[PDB]
Design a protein around this ligand. Structure first.
Ligand SMILES: [Cl-]
Ligand SMILES: [Cl-]
Ligand SMILES: [Cl-]
Ligand SMILES: [Cl-]
Ligand SMILES: [Cl-]
Ligand SMILES: [Cl-]
Ligand SMILES: [Cl-]
Ligand SMILES: [K+]
Ligand SMILES: [Mg+2]
Ligand SMILES: [Mg+2]
Ligand SMILES: [Mg+2]
Ligand SMILES: [Mg+2]
Ligand SMILES: [Mg+2]
Ligand SMILES: [Mg+2]
Ligand SMILES: [Mg+2]
Ligand SMILES: [Mg+2]
Ligand SMILES: [Mg+2]
Ligand SMILES: [Mg+2]
Ligand SMILES: [Mg+2]
Ligand SMILES: [Mg+2]
Ligand SMILES: [Mg+2]
Ligand SMILES: [Mg+2]
Ligand SMILES: [Mg+2]
Ligand SMILES: [Mg+2]
Ligand SMILES: [Mg+2]
Ligand SMILES: [Mg+2]
Ligand SMILES: [Mg+2]
Ligand SMILES: [Mg+2]
Ligand SMILES: [Mg+2]
Ligand SMILES: [Mg+2]
Ligand code: NA
Ligand code: NA
Ligand code: NA
Ligand code: NA
Ligand code: NA
Ligand code: NA
Ligand code: NA
Ligand code: NA
Ligand code: NA
Ligand code: NA
Ligand code: NA
Ligand code: NA
Ligand code: NA
Ligand code: NA
Ligand code: NA
Ligand code: NA
Ligand code: NA
Ligand SMILES: [Sr+2]
Ligand SMILES: [Sr+2]
Ligand SMILES: [Sr+2]
Ligand SMILES: [Sr+2]
Ligand SMILES: [Sr+2]
Ligand SMILES: [Sr+2]
Ligand SMILES: [Sr+2]
Ligand SMILES: [Sr+2]
Ligand SMILES: [Sr+2]
Ligand SMILES: [Sr+2]
Ligand SMILES: [Sr+2]
Ligand SMILES: [Sr+2]
Ligand SMILES: [Sr+2]
Ligand SMILES: [Sr+2]
Ligand SMILES: [Sr+2]
Ligand SMILES: [Sr+2]
Ligand SMILES: [Sr+2]
Ligand SMILES: [Sr+2]
Ligand SMILES: [Sr+2]
Ligand SMILES: [Sr+2]
Ligand SMILES: [Sr+2]
Ligand SMILES: [Sr+2]
Ligand SMILES: [Sr+2]
Ligand SMILES: [Sr+2]
Ligand SMILES: [Sr+2]
Lengths: 132, 142, 172, 160, 337
RNA sequence: CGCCACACGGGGUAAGAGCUGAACGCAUCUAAGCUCGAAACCCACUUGGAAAAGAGACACCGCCGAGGUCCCGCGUACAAG
RNA sequence: CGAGUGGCUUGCUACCUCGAUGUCGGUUCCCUCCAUCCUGCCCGUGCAGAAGCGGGCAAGGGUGAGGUUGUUCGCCUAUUAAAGGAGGUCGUGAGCUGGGUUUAGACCGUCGUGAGACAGGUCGGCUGCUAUCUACUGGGUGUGUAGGUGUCUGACAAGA
RNA sequence: UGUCCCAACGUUGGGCCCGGUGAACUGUACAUUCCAGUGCGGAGUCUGGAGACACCCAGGGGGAAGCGAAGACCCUAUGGA
RNA sequence: AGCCUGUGUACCAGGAGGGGAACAACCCAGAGAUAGGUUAAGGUCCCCAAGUGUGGAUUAAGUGUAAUCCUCUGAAGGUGGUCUCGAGCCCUAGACAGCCGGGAGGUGAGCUUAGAAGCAGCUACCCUCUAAGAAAAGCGUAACAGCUUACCGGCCGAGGUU
């Protein structure tokens, strides 16, 4: 993928439960897999800011609940490093459901998003209210 | 560094194994032998099969070790050792009375031992020790 | 057996050891003709290829040495020439001789130029869509010609559709 | 079942049907092919397939080789061509298999095979000088389906 | 089904034993291209700090933007090329032929060597030039040593000696180039060899950790879950199969870890100056203060503070040189805190 | 869990693409000869390595004194050594 | 239908071992094989392209995480370039585990007049030892080469 | 929630060095081995090669089909209970 | 099956010594002590005693350098790799191959068909010119065209073909 523009310490693994920062009807997401990733023996697959992931809906509306969907990580508690050396971290871990073309399924995003993610996924950004 | 050889052998265009055999025989009889122009010694056969055999010897080994020589210098010296009871007193004495050289470090020319000469005009299927060494990865210092 | 080749008047052939050198107004060529028990020599105004052995393998090489020598005679006099034509469909192919090698640009629309180094004292003259490879040594000339053609080889797609490339048009 | 199990003559002759029951039927469809209403004398050419080693040939092999042989003759000379071919051997030797360890191992009956000494004619065809190369090609196919190497020997036929 | 997994640790840096010379020894040199020149220099590690640089890379989306980069500060005072050794090519490889020494020696070079009192610089030169005429001359190297005394933070006064190859141009020309340097007094500087922005390979003897177990030394796992409470926590499962009936040298075991020679490739030189611009408030921890000739290497360098590190023009650079990077800031903030 | 660094290029081949070329007047990539061609082979690079028994090379110092040991203050080192 | 190679499965034999060579599965750690799953380079195509399908050279490197089950195998899920197979006493208990198998307690079904059984199921149920030799990982002292200091060479050896 | 990803740093007692005290297990012999082979088919000792200068310290336990118990399983005995 | 179970015999068991790398029963050999000599099996380039023996041929794969065998594999099938022996036919009235030239008229046969003209199918398959030349052997065309084979001649010059 296109360079992210920041160094990321993945703060999530397969099985992590995260916030769904949109209005798709899904409230909580469970990380199932990480796009393009391949680990090593005994390593739990990890994901962080900017990664595209496959998820299953843990909490939300009946219709969304249990559906296996694609998403993009927009916020994470573990710090990331920017070119100027400064570390940046968020209040929670969150992702945004997205389709085959990487367009957000929802109409609105909830909470801030990291600029780095905004740059990589434009249509996702053109849905954000706050870009940090 | 000065080897008082009673005999100087010229291995150029000479079948390695045949020279090695006569040299081992002489060393056991008390002769101090210097083999010269080892890089030009020769070994008959199909180059590709000969090389495979020497490469296999290089690949063999383990912790106990199977240090096989790559230079024509050592290849030839080893060929001679295999014709001497180098682990017996008399055998090690003979072996240590033999030395092989790249080129000719002496002023005298070496003699060509009878029955060891190869005729290039009559043979095309053979290889040079120097060619083997280069293939093995040796540093062509000659 | 033995075969005698009368050397042309335009030509003069010398030879030391296993190497034979042939010189003419078109240049010179030197080759090594080494095979077990086959003696090649220049006896006056003739070249002699002989052997005491007459088995199939020996006869094979003798016949091979003859043609090599007759070819050398021809090369130093008449010379050797291969003709080539550059064909292309969509992307115009730029073929130029730069230094000791022939460079081909925009082949199939590629950004990276393809190239090969000319062999020996072979000459490669290009005129529009036509190429002419020539020289005294048929080996070097034949290879350079072949090399140019091979240089536009494609294994990835159907050749019946993608035919761009330079092809040997005339063989000497 | 592999032929390696029965190709050799390493057992007594076992043919007596008065002391053997349950013998499977032979898979050999015919022993006389071509025009059997005609004599072999009426032909200029006679070619045989000679077995080069002594062996046992299971009826399943005789049928495969014979079939692939005659099959070719039919496809080249016609379902009525002017030729005739004979499979002169019959599978008299009954075979067993011990299919309980080595205890009371005398095997149950499982088939039949023909014993053939090296140099014998397994098949023999009779044709016209024309179809001589067709019968030779039929045998090439036949010997590819029987254990031993064979010779394609031409008997009457001086049209070389 | 027993998943695959690469082995633990590399088999290319063995045996993992204590280094023989604390002073690094390059086993390879740059190729001959430019004009003659000494292919290396040396200094003493002081510590680290960071700097803000203007992105240099022309292919980087950030070209022309601020960028914080970690740097290790190395004190690189002038050294003394005290002699010129010639090598001859022999059937057994290269061998020292002779040496051409000087007269002017640093006041304390005698803490390591028996300094020459009587030497013939021309006889030596003579023999060397004849070797070249004969065509038996192998590369040319300078015997070099440091001047620890010029570095206060380093207790040591005893100079560290190392041979450094001279390459570039024609042998005749670089031979004369070599004699030139030596004869002066051999005094040369970091400036005479490297320019900020070029890539250098740095070699040094890593920090010593004494005896360490397989987990730390080879990176093998610790025993897991229930297997961690039975009496084994940091021991590998087994030393090998039933057969072969022996322990292979390839299974990870305990032993010396650290104090090994390492040659780190492609270290970008951020800046070569002199003075105390890079020194840190309160002083580099466990070192002292810098105020003299220094070099700023991008990133990390093997060895603890005070160890001798060696520089050599990169022998396998991956990137073209982007000379004299613009430095907009050099942190002088205390390293304690 | 953080940060830094970890080629490009040569050489010889396999399968394969070809050149010249007989045996076999032709044809033929092969029989002799040759041009190419793999993450693979060798070199390149890193690490160890005078106990390599052919047990190595160079320079200087010293044989009434060069150098070294004990001793003492200490760690860039360290389980003893 | 015919001819073979292997020694991963199963069967057969009773050659070795009953004054004991501890079992299955898993785990950890190391080496290997190629009949190649991916990666490199090729040939063919019912090869336009993209992609498939089949074939060749090739063992450098890689071949991962999870749900049921003691399971091996396998079924299943999402990832992946691919998520290949096999040998090393079915590598590995003087390394681990003890779920399964495989004592002594107990229950069910079936069988047995009964004691009791079952190549069925089920709950519980113990893992000793200070390393002599050898092997290897690292560390020293001596002898040999034959006064000292400093600098090197590079036969060999290891690497993905 | 360090069971795990994936391991880190630290604490106390040992371990290591020194004074004193001071056992046991085990021992046909020889014994620096490694790769193959052979052999009652599972060899440090036989055969062929390879490697191997002696001694010592620490280590984790690959091998000595390691030590510890005249196999508990299975069969056999004109055995026992 | 280094399996099970007979039979005759010699061997191991209970049999040394020599050879077979090692190796109960494969080879020589049956053996008091000691000594000289000559052989046996097996071997004679070196390790290791004796040949780098002689006349001759084949093999280029390191095939092989392996009597027997749990132990030494190598099969069906295939081979213009190479050597040797034989049979038939053709040939200096010029063979085999290559190259050059000619490959022609009635007539695009008849039939079928809108059409088919060597070459969709069916039937026939005849004669002029001539040194040859099909009622056409293989591609090719919507059908023609076009390209070659047959067949004849030329250049060449010695074996060729089955
Ligand atoms: Cl996953
Ligand atoms: Cl080794
Ligand atoms: Cl010996
Ligand atoms: Cl030859
Ligand atoms: Cl574990
Ligand atoms: Cl007797
Ligand atoms: Cl060989
Ligand atoms: K037992
Ligand atoms: Mg696991
Ligand atoms: Mg700090
Ligand atoms: Mg701070
Ligand atoms: Mg038994
Ligand atoms: Mg393969
Ligand atoms: Mg495709
Ligand atoms: Mg491998
Ligand atoms: Mg298994
Ligand atoms: Mg096991
Ligand atoms: Mg064990
Ligand atoms: Mg245990
Ligand atoms: Mg224990
Ligand atoms: Mg249970
Ligand atoms: Mg009870
Ligand atoms: Mg239980
Ligand atoms: Mg045990
Ligand atoms: Mg008992
Ligand atoms: Mg019992
Ligand atoms: Mg009783
Ligand atoms: Mg007895
Ligand atoms: Mg002798
Ligand atoms: Mg062989
Ligand atoms: Na040979
Ligand atoms: Na080796
Ligand atoms: Na314990
Ligand atoms: Na075990
Ligand atoms: Na290459
Ligand atoms: Na088999
Ligand atoms: Na297990
Ligand atoms: Na591989
Ligand atoms: Na599972
Ligand atoms: Na076992
Ligand atoms: Na246990
Ligand atoms: Na187990
Ligand atoms: Na903890
Ligand atoms: Na052990
Ligand atoms: Na007897
Ligand atoms: Na013997
Ligand atoms: Na062989
Ligand atoms: Sr002799
Ligand atoms: Sr039988
Ligand atoms: Sr057959
Ligand atoms: Sr150095
Ligand atoms: Sr080195
Ligand atoms: Sr426990
Ligand atoms: Sr073993
Ligand atoms: Sr090829
Ligand atoms: Sr030494
Ligand atoms: Sr026992
Ligand atoms: Sr293979
Ligand atoms: Sr592939
Ligand atoms: Sr199952
Ligand atoms: Sr199993
Ligand atoms: Sr395993
Ligand atoms: Sr249990
Ligand atoms: Sr069960
Ligand atoms: Sr039960
Ligand atoms: Sr000694
Ligand atoms: Sr211990
Ligand atoms: Sr001879
Ligand atoms: Sr002979
Ligand atoms: Sr066996
Ligand atoms: Sr056999
Ligand atoms: Sr065969």
């Amino acid at each position: 993928m296109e360079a992210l523009g920041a160094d990321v310490t993945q703060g999530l693994e397969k099985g992590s439960l995260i916030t769904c920062a949109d209005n798709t009807g899904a409230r909580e997401l469970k990380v199932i897999s990480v796009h393009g990733y391949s680990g090593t023996k005994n390593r739990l697959p990890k994901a962080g800011l900017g990664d595209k992931i496959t998820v299953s809906v843990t909490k939300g509306t009946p219709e969304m609940r249990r559906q296996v969907l694609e998403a993009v990580v927009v916020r994470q508690r573990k710090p990331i490093r920017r070119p100027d050396g400064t570390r940046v971290k968020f209040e929670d871990n969150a992702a945004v459901i997205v389709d085959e073309n990487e367009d957000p399924r929802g109409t609105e995003l909830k909470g801030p998003i990291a600029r780095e993610v905004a740059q990589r996924f434009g249509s996702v950004a053109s849905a954000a209210t706050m870009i940090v | 560094a000065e080897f008082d050889a009673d005999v100087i052998v010229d291995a150029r265009d000479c079948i390695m194994g045949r020279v090695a055999s006569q040299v081992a025989e002489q060393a056991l009889d008390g002769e101090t032998v210097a083999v010269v122009n080892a890089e030009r010694a020769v070994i008959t056969g199909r180059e590709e099969q000969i090389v495979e055999k020497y490469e296999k010897r290089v690949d063999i080994g383990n912790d106990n070790g199977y240090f096989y020589p790559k230079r024509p210098d050592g290849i030839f010296k080893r060929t001679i050792r295999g014709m001497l009871p180098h682990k017996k007193q008399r055998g090690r004495e003979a072996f240590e009375s033999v030395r092989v050289y790249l080129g000719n470090p002496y002023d005298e020319d070496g003699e060509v031992l009878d029955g060891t000469s190869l005729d290039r005009l009559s043979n095309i299927k053979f290889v040079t020790l120097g060619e083997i060494s280069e293939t093995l990865g040796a540093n062509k210092t000659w | 057996p033995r075969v005698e080749l009368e050397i042309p008047e335009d030509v003069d052939a010398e030879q030391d050891h296993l190497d034979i050198t042939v010189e003419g107004d078109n240049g010179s060529v030197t080759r090594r003709l080494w095979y077990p028990d086959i003696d090649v020599s220049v006896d006056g105004d003739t070249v002699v290829i002989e052997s005491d052995e007459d088995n199939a393998k020996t006869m094979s090489t003798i016949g091979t040495f003859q043609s090599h020598i007759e070819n050398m005679f021809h090369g130093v006099t008449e010379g050797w020439e291969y003709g080539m034509e550059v064909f292309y469909s969509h992307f115009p192919m730029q073929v130029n001789v730069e230094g000791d090698e022939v460079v081909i640009e925009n082949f199939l629309g590629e950004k990276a130029p393809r190239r090969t180094t000319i062999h020996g004292d072979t000459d490669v003259e290009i005129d529009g869509e036509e190429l002419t490879v020539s020289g005294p040594d048929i080996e070097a000339v034949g290879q350079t010609a072949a090399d140019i053609e091979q240089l536009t080889r494609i294994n990835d797609k159907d050749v019946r559709v993608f035919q761009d490339g330079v092809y040997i048009t005339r063989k000497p | 079942k592999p032929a390696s199990m029965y190709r050799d003559i390493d057992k007594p002759a076992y043919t007596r049907r008065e002391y053997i029951t349950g013998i499977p039927g032979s898979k050999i469809a015919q022993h006389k092919m071509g025009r059997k209403q005609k004599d072999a004398d009426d032909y200029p050419v006679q070619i045989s397939l000679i077995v080069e080693e002594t062996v046992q040939l299971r009826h399943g092999s005789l049928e495969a080789s014979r079939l692939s042989a005659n099959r070719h003759l039919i496809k080249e000379l016609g379902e009525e061509g002017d030729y005739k071919m004979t499979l002169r051997k019959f599978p008299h030797q009954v075979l067993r298999e011990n299919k309980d360890g080595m205890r009371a191992a005398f095997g149950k009956i499982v088939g039949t095979a023909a014993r053939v000494q090296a140099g014998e004619q397994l098949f023999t065809a009779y044709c016209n000088v024309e179809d001589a190369e067709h019968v030779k090609e039929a045998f090439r196919r036949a010997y590819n389906k029987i254990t031993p190497s064979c010779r394609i020997d031409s008997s009457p036929a001086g049209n070389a | 089904p027993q998943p695959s997994r690469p082995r633990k640790g590399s088999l290319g840096f063995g045996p993992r034993k204590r280094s023989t010379s604390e002073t690094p020894r390059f086993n390879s040199w740059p190729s001959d291209d430019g004009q003659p020149g000494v292919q290396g220099f040396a200094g003493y590690k002081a510590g680290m700090t960071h700097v803000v640089l203007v992105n240099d890379e022309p292919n980087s989306p950030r070209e022309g933007m601020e960028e914080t980069v970690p740097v290790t500060v190395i004190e690189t005072p002038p050294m003394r090329a005290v002699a010129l050794r010639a090598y001859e090519d022999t059937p057994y490889g290269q061998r020292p032929l002779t040496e051409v020494w000087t007269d002017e020696f640093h006041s304390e070079l005698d803490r390591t060597l028996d300094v020459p009192e009587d030497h013939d610089p021309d006889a030596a030169e003579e023999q060397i030039r004849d070797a070249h005429e004969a065509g038996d001359l192998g590369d040319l190297r300078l015997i070099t040593h440091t001047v620890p005394d010029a570095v206060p933070s380093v207790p040591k006064k005893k100079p560290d000696v190392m041979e450094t190859r001279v390459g570039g141009g024609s042998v005749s020309d670089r031979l004369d180039h070599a004699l030139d340097i030596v004869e002066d007094g051999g005094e040369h500087a970091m400036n005479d060899i490297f320019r900020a922005g070029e890539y250098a390979d740095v070699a040094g003897v890593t920090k010593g950790k004494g005896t360490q177990g397989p987990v730390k030394r080879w990176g093998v796992q610790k025993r897991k879950g229930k297997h961690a409470r039975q009496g084994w926590r940091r021991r590998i499962g087994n030393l090998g199969p039933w057969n072969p009936s022996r322990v292979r040298s390839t299974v990870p075991q305990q032993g010396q870890t650290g104090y090994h020679q390492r040659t780190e490739l492609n270290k970008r030189l951020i800046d070569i100056g002199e003075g105390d611009e890079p020194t840190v408030d309160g002083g580099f921890v466990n070192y002292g203060e810098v105020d003299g000739p220094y070099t700023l290497v991008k990133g990390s360098v093997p060895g603890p503070d005070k160890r001798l590190v060696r520089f050599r023009p990169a022998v396998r650079p991956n990137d073209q040189p982007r000379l004299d990077p613009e430095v907009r800031y050099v942190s002088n903030e205390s390293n304690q805190g």
